[PDB]
Design a protein around this ligand. Structure first.
Ligand SMILES: *[C@@H]1O[C@H](CO)[C@@H](O)[C@H](O)[C@H]1NC(C)=O
Lengths: 110, 33, 123
């Protein structure tokens, strides 16, 4: 059972570019699309991307990014003190046939 | 929109071009279903 | 305009079954393939079940196979998940997620999420 592998936590000063890497294998990310979800504390997670690049209307432009291979990546800039949240990488599996999810990475504004 | 309707399970549905100091006019007649 | 109401959330004892019965509003129900995603407190999301527009199930997570039964009625605009034989690890908050597609498994993105309900399983 392959599992998506996000970084446990991330920290960066405001303004810089922040990388969140969801690492998997050929069956999960190497063959299909990955989407990314944003969760604030005490809130229902919401769409922040899809099709590995595209963004839902309202999706922060500052947070965008696509990666190839077995890994996907999200890039963030203009980190406002409100952008502290948890980011999930969602993926489908072609072999085991069950949707996989990322562990979750929390973003801190220093 | 959405001020008129509240909820509904729909059966028929149709979409087309818009119907229209101007004078519109219509005749609505319902016969034989 | 898309509100997803939940139900059936409340403390349940370690061995009794339960029925979480999500709802819907403001969108065509029988066109979209709904889901059920849980989240244990202090942890990330864990997919629990899926379903399609024909109510042909997708499959359950490996940990909950043969003890969760997901169904739906497109007339009553609902999506039920009859938990059977719960345990300690099954405590979580259950979002009634959504899918844009009707086939669920070409790599789909789940748009709208309900506020979810909390199921706690303790003595
Ligand atoms: C709408 O749903 C109600 C309850 O199932 C049913 O009685 C009624 O016939 C339905 N209306 C139509 C025709 O969509």
């Amino acid at each position: 059972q392959s599992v998506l592998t996000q970084p446990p936590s991330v920290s960066a000063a405001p303004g810089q570019k922040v990388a969140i890497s969801c690492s998997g294998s050929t069956s999960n990310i190497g063959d299909n699309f990955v989407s990314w979800y944003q969760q604030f504390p005490g809130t229902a997670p919401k769409l922040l991307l899809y099709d590995d690049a595209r963004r839902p209307s309202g999706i922060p432009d500052r947070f965008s990014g696509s990666k190839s291979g077995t890994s996907a990546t999200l890039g963030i800039t203009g980190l406002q003190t409100g952008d502290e949240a948890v980011y999930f990488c969602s993926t489908w599996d072609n072999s085991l046939n069950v949707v996989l999810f990322g562990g979750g990475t929390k973003l801190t504004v220093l | 929109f959405r001020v008129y309707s509240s909820a509904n399970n729909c059966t028929f549905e149709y979409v087309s071009q818009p119907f229209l100091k101007n004078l519109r006019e219509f005749v609505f007649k319902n016969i034989d279903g | 305009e898309v509100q997803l109401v939940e139900s059936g959330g409340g403390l349940v004892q370690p061995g009794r079954s339960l029925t979480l019965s999500c709802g819907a509003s403001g969108f065509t129900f029988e066109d979209y393939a709904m889901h059920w995603v849980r989240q244990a407190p202090g942890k990330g999301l864990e997919w629990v079940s899926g379903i399609d527009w024909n109510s042909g199930v997708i499959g359950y997570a490996d940990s909950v196979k043969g003890r969760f039964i997901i169904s739906r009625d497109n007339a009553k605009n609902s999506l039920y998940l009859h938990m059977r034989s719960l345990t300690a690890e099954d405590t979580a908050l259950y979002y009634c997620a959504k899918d844009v597609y009707s086939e669920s498994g070409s790599g789909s993105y789940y748009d709208y999420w309900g506020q979810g309900t909390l199921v706690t399983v303790s003595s």
